[PDB]
Amino acid sequence: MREIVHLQAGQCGNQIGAKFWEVISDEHGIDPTGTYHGDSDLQLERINVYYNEATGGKYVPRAVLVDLEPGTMDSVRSGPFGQIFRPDNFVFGQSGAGNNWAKGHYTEGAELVDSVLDVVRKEAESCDCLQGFQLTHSLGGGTGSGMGTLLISKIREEYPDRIMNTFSVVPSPKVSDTVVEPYNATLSVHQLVENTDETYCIDNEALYDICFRTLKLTTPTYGDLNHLVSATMSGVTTCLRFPGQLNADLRKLAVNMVPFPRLHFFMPGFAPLTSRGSQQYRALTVPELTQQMFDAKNMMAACDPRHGRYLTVAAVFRGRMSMKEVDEQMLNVQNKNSSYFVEWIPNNVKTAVCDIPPRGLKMSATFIGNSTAIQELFKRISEQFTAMFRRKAFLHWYTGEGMDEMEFTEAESNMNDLVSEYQQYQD
Template sequence: MSSSLLILLPFPPYTTYFTLFPSIFLCQPKQNLSNSLSFSTMREILHVQGGQCGNQIGSKFWEVICGEHGVDLTGRYNADGESSDNHLERINVYYNESSGGRYVPRAVLMDLEPGTMDSIRSGPYGQIFRPDNFVFGQSGAGNNWAKGHYTEGAELIDAVLDVVRKEAESCDCLQGFQVCHSLGGGTGSGMGTLLISKIREEYPDRMMMTFSVFPSPKVSDTVVEPYNATLSVHQLVENADECMVLDNEALYDICFRTLKLTTPSFGDLNHLISGTMSGVTCCLRFPGQLNSDLRKLAVNLIPFPRLHFFMVGFAPLTSRGSQQYISLTVPELTQQMWDAKNMMCAADPRHGRYLTASAMFRGKMSTKEVDEQMINVQNKNSSYFVEWIPNNVKSSVCDIPPKNLRMASTFVGNSTSIQEMFRRVSEQFTAMFRRKAFLHWYTGEGMDEMEFTEAESNMNDLVAEYQQYQDAAVDDEGEYDEDVDGVEEDYES
């Protein structure tokens, strides 16, 4: 009976039919077609920056992105004689177009004191941000993780989440979040990790990528850095998908050694970081031959869920004086991006092995040449790659190079040598925690010693995990039985 009823039903009106089967009706002029389908290419990223360090890195990043997309200091598009199609096609990844034709960054800026916010507002790009998206307190976190996570930060977090929600609702298809913060202070570490855990609760299926500035081995700004960093890593292991690990000392070294700057400023350091940040997402924003995005990056780089702390690098990095003597070629970029001196964190990849790596190239180049170079690197340095993950280097090629460069590349590597950083911080943490030094500042904000003990053991577990996979060999699990071994020996002979 029901089947005959179905046959007798009339066709729905055309409007309804279009909503059910839009592809049948898509024979229309080309420009309308691209407009009607533009929603499918929008993969927005919501940017959050917290604390003094995070806000300074973040504001430098927006300078770079504005330059790449031709957005001027007022948020207007300024073609500058270049192809507008490439600039505007996917500008929505990082920008929201307002009714007045201005491009407004999808950015949330937070801090527990007004100082950094004021300097961003009064800076050259201060006018492009939505005024409502500046969320700040007055008291500061005083380099105390507990203040950022449990007291001062907890009072401000709802206001920040409201702005995050508003921005997320204005997206067509939010791909994920990127957070800039440091782990040594109070706001970026304490309130930053609080925000990450709240966002994770509310948007569990969106990607969470962080650019985290770790305490430097020799240069210390704050005595309690090891406490703040260990408590932060405890949170990042559980709540972040991808952590790009940076530190000031490695960045200073790049400025001194490679760029030959005699007195590098934080601005120079932040410029290095922003080049990497834009490189990681360039495939989402510009057309390319081999695309990559936050989720593809995670799927290809994270063999085990807790091991998501990456080393990053960028090429070309050359001093002003030697730029004219260097030819920008794919082999040249490849050689520099894999160079240990080029890594932006204080861990030496030669002391460990790569579980996985990703190379994101930008500019006009042949994918065949890129593939050949990647295979070449793996063959020549096979001892530095774990043999039980074959073909563990992912590459992508984006056609549009960064501003003022013919080609460039961004490197992201998951190396077991990153444990050097965790081990160093853990040793400093243990030395102070054994004597309960400075602990009263944290317990005074309501924290319990137990939380310190848990964070310490989580960090030590992480180091042990990296070491375990560094030492692992193909046949550790005993997958092969004797017969198979015999066959293999015959084959080799």
């Protein structure tokens, strides 16, 4: 049987996986202590895709936690579900980050890659057959990119036959806090496109805008933001864990989503987001779901695909619906904007219907998108990289670590080579 092992990297990913995991435990109805309370037969059955069974009916999460700063681990261990996570799975380092990409990629990783590889292969041999792996981290995250780029390279030759899902957050376009962050992102993405097959793009500014749009609660918590993305990541994973005539496996989806090899960056899309009075002012119907499902405001990933065109679109539907409403709704959407799709590929819509609703609503869905709206992102970072690399600011650290501008040359070039590739297909 085919299962998944998760990887939790970077200090954001440390917050990402925590909320990501507790949702699943609450979804399957396990107590914080770990004693599962048998209530749903189906979730009792297909929990082995992610969790192993340990004694006393406790379901050990099959994730590995990695970092350098103990305070983050002490916090997450002290959380409501830190007891469910294994001290076996808490691998870390004795060093502070400096949030330097090179140190986590050349210096600190070297004496930690050995330990983490043993842990995962112990977990890999603990399981029977894998679809692959998924990673929670950030591309702009100083240390998470340090482990991520290294480990994905190592796991490539280790298991080049599995699903190497990646989940990273794009930093805020308006401000990056970290000033060497554009260096770190450019460094990471070069190996990312070289290595990964799947990548989710996430940005906080839209999340703040969504909070201003539907959450209408002034001051949220970053964990609430983590809940939103975890809800999305839950939705895409509800395919595998749940029955119903939907085709769930990722490369059943992936071959449907990617036209050409270097297309790994994909954008999410989610289903009803509702405000305080609209819960009792909304007639929850697939049309208004579909309308809301395809909203530029419902977008949250990077920026509006209104500026570009739509290469491939896939909406997975979770709940008690039928073939015809999604059949007519898709027929509705193509007739609305036929030109906004590329003439290159017609019928670029791929739909899945999960019949197992979430715990509280039935009419639900999720969207994964590949449009021509990523250009602005790295085009932005292009001026960032060129301007700072114009006068090599903050560079003596990397040379002190042992890094050269030569690595930067092909890194941006490979990035720029991707830019020409996106546009020349779509234009």
